[PDB]
Design goal:
part of a larger assembly; 6 chains; C: 209 residues; alpha/beta; five-stranded mixed beta sheet; 11 strands; F: 171 residues; mainly beta; 2 domains; five-stranded antiparallel beta sheet; five-stranded mixed beta barrel; elongated; nucleotide binding (chain D); DNA-directed RNA polymerase (chain D)
Chain lengths: 1033, 59, 209, 129, 79, 171
């Protein structure tokens, strides 16, 4: 029953799950309901109301299937209903509705006005009402908003609310706590009892936090040196967020701490408590902060934009300095003083130098503007909390708008060598080329306004096409993975029943319950890892402090326990080695189902564990308990070797992290957990992991498409990225836009710069055109004439030897000059060039070379004597001259236009090799990124790494390395574009897309159709269980 | 459209002469050389063809 | 260039010897990590315009499980490979009574000669390998995971545990460079132990078809 | 049981050759001319008139020469006869447009070569103004 | 017997079992557990699952064509 | 879609037309039976180009009507299922857009139309316009649609289209 579309308005009072609907719309919509004795009277009164009154029924259906309209009401007897009938009663409060393939259900609330109300935490919408009870029950159980998961008007106030400065009087506290649904009813004790009570904002927010959840976060304006300083725990600026036992002891909240992220209060509560409790957390924050906002208040005005005169002079001074610097650069290029970089030309190099000067000025002036704003300033409050806006937006409002680039470059010369008629011809100054030095508040000049419009026009055009293209990808991905689902054997299969993945995400765990954490058994070197993990029982004094007197005696009494302690460390050391191969990059961050560090902290608070007293936990219990826990955690149930082998692989990382986190030394050194605490810890891990198992019947394919399509909207050597690359990744078109190849060098040359140039030349393809200066066809009657005067001196001595002079020689010539500068860059030699011409073309012509030491290089080519004795020699020379200047490769590989060589500052490109000590170190290795794909020939080259040399073109990798290598390459390219803008996507979703494309052994283009179900189990009735039961009537 | 053939193509005679101008007439399906058009006009002499195209003989 | 040929031929020999080891044939330890310096010393002369040719580069290895299952790696020694030379090689292999042989063809192959590999008897198994392909070891590449060929006994047990069919398993082209490297044919299952980021290790099985 | 996207349809239509909307107008014009003057016969059926306007409104080519040139140009390729009229009638603006509208083309046509075919059709089709 | 599926009950199974049972309860179906005034049918079925009395038997179809009969009472629910 | 075919039709000729040059009457009769009709199997027979040949006239016993199997060349309009083709809008209603694909008429349901589109009864004339107003479908508007299915009714073919697929609309 689709409804009439109506606009959307916000309503913080309503819960996020609840939705407001007008009376008129609900009157038209009807919900068939089966009448039962327990609610026979309820349907009897509603039907009596009629359709004139809103709480009525449009139609009533009898057992035989006949529908009687209630508008007429012909007979009172017909109005009366019997048990088992279906009544289409109008929608009322408490009903479940579903609207925007993943749809979220909502609980309808009737409101007086017409427009729909949604507790966003505008666009028209239509809400669908599930008529059947079965689907209504299912929707409310899995499709509700709490299971699907803050406005910018609340995050900004939240940061102000938690500020230490905020103090609340008794009267104010009463109002804030009244809106708190999850309130025990007891007013907390004031922080400042005298001279007058004053509740801090955190104290009120402490009750908002549900249950006891512990996490540590940092405010956006958190100085880096503050953590290293002695005031790390006592933050000078309250920039550190710590929560203990559900109480916000310190720290100002913001998007980083309260907003959705890998680690946040909402995220931690979702895993610790669930979705229902998490929703109340959202509602409490929205309601309480809104009431407080009426007291504090949030605003914005000219005063925020108006900065102090001191900063205005600095901004103009920086702008003036940048403008003068640009003129100096222009003057250097005008006088030919500027020297182009070897990897760029003069015109492009000048555009690069000027761009940096203007770009740097905007950032420097913009950064000063951020410091200019005071705490009271409203502009700073928004950015500091990170709710809305950005530091760049403030920069364009206060300091400077910045350069207005068009098509990735400055304003082009639309007119004859001038951007606009006002500017002189061939003007490359700041104002002429579109540099906007005036902020929005100050006002732009007439020239700047048009240039600003040109820049804005490009963004609008890109935005218009970006949505169209991005939306196309979302539909295409869903169709190709619509049938992908997890079956009851913990396998991912499609409609055809083909195995896409043995285990979902290669681990068999849901992508929602997994939490980010960093196991600490791979980063420490061989000196810190041993000290931090290997238990040392030789120190009598140390053990007494850590363990009670009896425990120290027990461990040193029998050698059986001592062997186990060393054995446990050996497993950790063995786990250390296997991690290195699994993680060559060495990054500690990794995705795991449940967070042990947080869970351990919860155990400490629940049991009130203090590190001062010795821990009563037996170290042998930790190793024994962990051993038992590992067996209880099962992914591939069975006893066959394949199941046992798969089980170890599936839980390889989890077991390694579990053992490292839970060991004899750590549990007695820092964690200090008691015997009872450890027992509770083991049970919690077992329960959390069990809940993390991928539930059969989950549309992982559809989830992956939604998870992959959402970041696609926020996407948009020159490497094409964003939508253009994402389009070229799903599409297997043989010719991408910029099929770049990254070449990694090995050995001594990988470190030196000059030694890497010869490799650059031998990979780059160079033709005679790029190395030649000029060519001509001269006439010489006899061989000794040599009409050219300059070359007569050197040709004579060379020609004395009768080489190819055994007979008559044609009087034509093909003398061609070679550029001196180009030869030096390629380190070419005259003999090398001559050899290729003779060998490449054969014995059809003969070439003569001059001395290399000569300032000008002369290359004379004449047709071979054998062919001399229809284009005899004159027209043929013209024909051959063009051929050797176009399709002649002196040295290099075809399809390689240019090679970019530069030391990689990024860590991923840099080689990471394990040092002797153990700590990871990344050396500096030269990398040659080259345009075009020649991986087959580039790999088979001297001084080129055959292992780390990978291309970005999946098609090339398929024909060289195979489909299996493409799966990893496709993952890297998909992750590279997704991570370019800072967004992150779970690996399981990315792996699923690659597996489906490569499931058939060859690259498959994503289904272009893009047109766009819980049937793996059936419910069966049992008579044995029905023997008991009494009818309600 | 008085087009000019690209140098990309290679041939026995095409490479020698290289780049030649071809003009397509509105009612002629194929591309006929521009030089022939002037001959049809009445300028049989080849020098007259260069006179109308090349104004600066010194260059 | 004579010097360039030494490295080009040395890489082919090094990769070829490692190919047999990966397949499952008995290969001497010294021949796998043989250095370029020893390549010239072993032959004692420059390959091009010298006594060392491609004909004598032929190597003979025996399967580890059974010594009677020898393998051949022939070199055409010619710019292009024709039918006549191919018939000679198989005819020559007939005397030794061997079932598999490897041909290291140069960049160019006669299209008619390609048909020789298709019309050969079922007991004839000739696998073509381009010179450029063997200059690098595909297996050692980081993107390429560890590939292990599954025996018939394992395949039947594997399907019984997972209750799977031949079509349900992921497919892999027979012409894949990795498939050609292992010399696998239709009906063979390849065990892929890749280092999955999530679970650390993830074993995948693909059927050649 | 028949679907145009999958190139499945009754076997009888295989022998038939497709026709362009503009080309059909010429055939209808030839039929119209003889009926109007050559023979004294009842007026043409309403169905004939309806399709005549449809072809005229959607006619992408002026004369037979333009129609023949496109037909000959597309015949050189391996384009299926069903796509021959479908591509010309639709006049996709870009290669991506045609593949989505015509799933068959994606099977045996690359993103680059087909783009060089659609743009050729653009140079042939002309507007009234 | 010889059942290899997870002992726990998936969220999808729980939603369908309660939904189907709730629909049955609304159709004058008997209730195994005692009734303490719970009018809404979903609440009646919800406590039935808690007490492990729902007669519904879940037949999980394996991808290979085999099926396993898992009782709601046998399966371990999360409360 | 328009095709060139060779069909067979048994022409029933009355004995009254047994005069001189009776083949002309058979030829002209074929321009009325198969012309302007719509066979359910081959679609609308919009026009007939030429006649291939006329078979021998067999006299049906008892009936007395001579049957003439004649082969002719004609062009048909057969809408293949799942085929995208341009259409002309003839009317617009709350139920959905009513299109006209040549001789036949194709109806577009509201559900098949993208959700962004919204019917406007106030605007004169009615036209399915989205809120953004970027694309509007007025009457006699050239729009592209995909025929999900076709049904034959009362010797006529009725088609159902949709615009959910990409690039279906004004363009």
């Amino acid at each position: 029953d689709f409804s009439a579309r109506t606009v959307i308005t916000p309503d913080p009072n309503l819960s996020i799950d609840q939705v407001g609907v007008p009376r008129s719309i609900a009157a038209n919509m009807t919900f068939a309901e089966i009448v039962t004795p327990f609610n026979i009277d309820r349907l009897q009164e509603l039907v009596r109301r009629g359709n004139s009154q809103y709480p009525g029924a449009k139609y009533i259906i009898r057992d035989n299937g006949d529908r009687i309209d209630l508008r007429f009401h012909p007979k009172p007897s017909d109005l009366h209903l019997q048990t088992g009938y279906k009544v289409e009663r109008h929608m009322c409060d408490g009903d479940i509705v579903i609207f925007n393939m993943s749809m979220m259900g909502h609980r309808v609330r009737i409101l007086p006005w017409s427009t729909f109300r949604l507790n966003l935490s505008g666009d028209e919408m239509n809400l669908h009402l599930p008529q059947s009870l079965e689907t209504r029950a299912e929707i409310q159980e899995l499709a509700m908003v709490p299971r699907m998961i803050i406005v910018q008007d609340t995050l900004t106030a939240v940061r102000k609310f938690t500020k230490r400065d905020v103090f609340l009087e008794r009267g104010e506290v009463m109002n804030l706590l009244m809106f708190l649904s999850t309130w025990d009813g007891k007013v907390p004790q004031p922080a400042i009892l005298k001279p007058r009570p004053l509740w801090t904002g955190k104290q009120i927010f402490s009750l908002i936090i549900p249950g006891h959840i512990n996490c540590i976060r940092t405010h956006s304006t958190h100085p880096d040196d503050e953590d290293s300083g002695p005031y790390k725990h006592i933050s000078p600026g309250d920039t550190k967020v710590v929560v203990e036992n559900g109480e916000l002891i310190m720290g100002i909240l913001c998007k980083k701490s309260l907003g959705t992220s890998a680690g946040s209060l909402v995220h931690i509560s979702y895993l610790e408590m669930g979705h229902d409790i998490t929703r109340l957390f959202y509602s409490n924050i929205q309601t309480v902060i809104n009431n407080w906002l009426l007291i504090e208040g949030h605003t914005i005005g000219i005063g925020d934009s108006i900065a102090d005169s001191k900063t205005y002079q600095d901004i103009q001074n920086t702008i003036k300095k940048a403008k003068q610097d640009v003129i100096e650069v222009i003057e250097k290029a005008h006088n030919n003083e500027l020297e182009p970089t070897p990897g760029n030309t003069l015109r492009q190099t000048f555009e690069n130098q000027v761009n940096r000067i203007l770009n740097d000025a905007r950032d420097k002036t913009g950064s000063s503007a951020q410091k200019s704003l005071s705490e009271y300033n409203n502009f700073k409050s928004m950015v500091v909390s990170g709710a809305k806006g950005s530091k760049i937006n403030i920069s364009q409002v206060i300091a400077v708008v910045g350069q207005q680039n068009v098509e990735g470059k400055r304003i082009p010369f639309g007119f004859k060598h001038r951007t606009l008629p006002h500017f002189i011809k061939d003007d490359y100054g700041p104002e002429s080329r579109g540099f906007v030095e005036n902020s929005y508040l100050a006002g732009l000049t007439p020239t700047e306004f048009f240039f600003h419009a040109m820049g804005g026009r490009e963004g609008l055009i890109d935005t218009a096409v970006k949505t169209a293209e991005t939306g196309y990808i979302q539909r295409r991905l869903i169709k190709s993975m619509e049938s992908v689902m997890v079956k009851y054997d913990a396998t991912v299969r499609n409609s055809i029943n083909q195995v896409v993945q043995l285990r979902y995400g290669e681990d068999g765990l849901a992508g929602e319950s997994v939490e980010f954490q960093n196991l600490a058994t791979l980063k420490p070197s061989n000196k810190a890892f041993e000290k931090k993990f290997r238990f040392d029982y030789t120190n009598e004094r140390a053990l007494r402090r850590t363990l009670q007197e009896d425990l120290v005696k027990d461990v040193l009494s029998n050698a059986h326990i001592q062997n186990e302690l060393e054995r446990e460390f050996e497993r950790m050391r063995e786990d250390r080695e296997v991690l290195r191969v699994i993680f060559p990059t060495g990054d500690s961050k990794v995705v795991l189902p449940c967070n042990l560090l947080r869970m351990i902290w919860n155990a400490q608070k629940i049991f009130h564990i203090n590190p001062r007293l010795p821990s009563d936990l037996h170290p042998i219990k930790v190793v024994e308990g962990v051993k038992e826990l590992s067996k209880k955690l099962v992914i591939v149930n069975g006893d066959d070797p394949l199941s046992r082998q798969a089980q170890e692989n599936a839980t390889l990382l989890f077991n390694i992290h579990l053992r490292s986190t839970l060991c004899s030394r750590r549990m007695a050194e820092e964690f200090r957990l008691s015997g009872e605490a450890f027992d509770w810890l083991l049970g919690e891990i077992e329960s959390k992991f069990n809940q993390a198992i991928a539930h059969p019947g989950e549309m992982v394919g559809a989830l992956a498409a939604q998870s992959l399509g959402e970041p696609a909207t926020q996407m948009t050597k020159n490497v094409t990225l964003g939508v253009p690359r994402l389009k070229e990744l799903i599409n297997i078109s043989k010719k991408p836009k910029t099929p770049s190849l990254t070449v990694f060098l090995l050995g001594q040359s990988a470190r030196d710069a000059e030694r890497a140039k010869d490799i650059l030349c031998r990979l780059e393809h160079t033709t005679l055109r790029k190395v030649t200066a000029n060519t001509a066809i001269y006439y010489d009657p006899n061989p000794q004439s040599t009409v050219v005067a300059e070359d007569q001196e050197w040709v004579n001595v060379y020609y004395e030897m009768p080489d190819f002079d055994v007979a008559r020689i044609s009087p034509w010539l093909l003398r061609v000059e070679l550029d001196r500068k180009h030869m030096t860059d390629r380190k070419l030699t005259m003999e090398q060039i001559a050899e290729k011409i003779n060998a490449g073309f054969g014995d059809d012509l003969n070439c003569i070379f001059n001395d290399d030491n000569a300032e000008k290089l002369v290359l004379r080519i004449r047709i071979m004597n054998s062919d001399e004795n229809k284009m005899d020699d004159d027209v043929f020379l013209r024909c051959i001259e063009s051929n050797m200047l176009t399709d002649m490769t002196l040295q290099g590989i075809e399809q390689i236009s240019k090679v970019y060589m530069h030391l990689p500052q990024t860590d991923n490109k840099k080689k990471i090799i394990i040092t002797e000590d153990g700590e990871f170190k990344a050396l500096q290795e030269w990398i040659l990124e080259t345009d075009g794909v020649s991986l087959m020939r580039v790999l088979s080259e001297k001084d080129v790494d055959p292992v780390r040399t990978t291309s970005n073109d999946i098609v090339e990798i398929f024909t060289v390395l195979g489909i299996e290598a493409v799966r990893k390459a496709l993952e890297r390219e998909l992750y590279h574009v997704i991570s370019f803008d800072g967004s992150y996507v779970n690996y399981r979703h990315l792996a699923l897309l690659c597996d489906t494309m490569t499931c058939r052994g060859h690259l498959m283009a994503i289904t272009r159709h893009g047109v766009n179900g819980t049937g793996c189990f059936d419910l069966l009735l049992d008579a044995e269980k029905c023997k008991y039961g009494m009818e309600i009537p | 459209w008085v087009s000019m053939l690209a140098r990309g193509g290679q041939g026995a005679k095409k490479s020698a002469i290289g780049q030649r101008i071809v003009a397509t007439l509105p009612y002629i399906k194929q591309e006929v050389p521009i030089i022939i058009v002037f001959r049809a006009l009445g300028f049989v002499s080849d020098r007259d063809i260069l006179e109308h195209i090349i104004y600066d003989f010194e260059d | 260039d004579d010097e360039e040929e030494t490295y080009r031929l040395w890489k082919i020999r090094k990769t070829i010897m490692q190919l047999c080891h990966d397949r499952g044939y008995l290969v001497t330890q010294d021949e796998l990590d043989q250095t370029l310096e020893e390549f010239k010393a072993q032959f004692g002369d420059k390959p091009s315009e010298g006594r060392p040719r491609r004909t004598d580069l032929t190597v003979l290895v025996a399967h580890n499980d059974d010594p009677t299952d020898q393998m051949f790696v022939f070199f055409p020694e010619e710019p292009k490979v024709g039918i006549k030379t191919i018939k000679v090689y198989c005819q020559r292999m007939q005397e030794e009574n061997i079932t598999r042989a490897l041909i290291v063809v140069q960049q160019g192959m006669t299209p008619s000669a390609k048909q020789s590999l298709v019309d050969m008897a079922p007991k004839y198994i000739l696998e073509q390998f381009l010179q450029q392909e063997l200059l690098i070891n595909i297996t050692e590449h980081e993107l390429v995971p560890e590939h292990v060929v599954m025996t018939k006994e394992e395949v039947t047990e594997l399907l019984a545990r997972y209750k799977l069919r031949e079509n349900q398993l992921p497919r892999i082209q027979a012409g894949d460079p990795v498939a050609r490297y292992f010399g696998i044919k239709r009906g063979q299952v390849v065990k892929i132990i890749r280092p999955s980021e999530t679970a650390g290790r993830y074993i995948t099985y693909r059927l050649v078809q | 049981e028949e679907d145009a996207s999958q190139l499945i349809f009754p076997k009888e239509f295989e022998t038939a050759e497709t026709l362009l909307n503009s080309e059909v107008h010429m055939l209808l014009e030839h039929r119209k001319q003889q009926n109007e003057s050559a023979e004294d016969e009842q007026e043409l059926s309403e169905v004939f008139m309806k399709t005549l306007n449809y072809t005229a409104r959607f006619s992408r080519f002026k004369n037979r020469e333009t129609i023949a040139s496109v037909r000959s140009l597309l015949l050189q390729k391996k384009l299926h006869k069903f796509e021959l009229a479908c591509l010309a009638n639709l006049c996709p603006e870009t290669a991506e447009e045609s593949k989505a509208l015509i799933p068959s083309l994606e099977g045996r046509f690359e993103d680059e070569e087909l783009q060089q075919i659609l743009d050729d059709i653009q140079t042939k089709r002309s507007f009234q103004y | 017997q010889k059942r290899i599926t997870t002992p726990y009950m998936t969220k999808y199974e729980r939603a369908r079992v309660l939904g189907t049972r709730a629909l049955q309860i609304a159709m004058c179906a008997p209730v195994m557990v005692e009734l303490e005034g719970e009018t809404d049918p979903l609440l009646i079925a919800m406590k039935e699952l808690k007490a492990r009395k729902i007669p519904i038997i879940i037949r999980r179809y394996l991808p290979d064509g085999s099926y396993e009969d898992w009782g709601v009472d046998e399966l371990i629910i999360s409360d | 879609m328009f095709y060139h075919i060779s069909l067979e039709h048994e022409i029933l000729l009355h004995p009254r037309y047994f005069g001189p040059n009776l083949l002309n009457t058979v030829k002209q009769k074929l321009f009325t039976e198969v012309e302007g009709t719509c066979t359910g199997k081959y679609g609308f027979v919009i026009a007939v180009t030429t006649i291939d040949n006329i078979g021998a006239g067999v006299i049906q016993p008892g009936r007395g009507f001579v049957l003439y199997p004649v082969k002719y060349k004609a062009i048909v309009f057969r809408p293949f299922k799942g085929e995208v083709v341009d259409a002309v809008v003839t009317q617009v209603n709350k139920v959905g857009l009513f299109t006209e694909i040549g001789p036949m008429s194709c109806f577009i349901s509201r559900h098949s139309i993208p959700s962004e589109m919204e019917f406007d009864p106030n605007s004169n004339p009615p036209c399915y316009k989205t809120m953004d107003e970027d694309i509007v479908i007025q009457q006699d508007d050239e729009i592209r649609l995909k025929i999900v299915g076709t049904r034959v009714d009362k010797n006529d073919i009725f088609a159902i289209g949709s615009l959910m697929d990409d690039y279906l609309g004004l363009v």
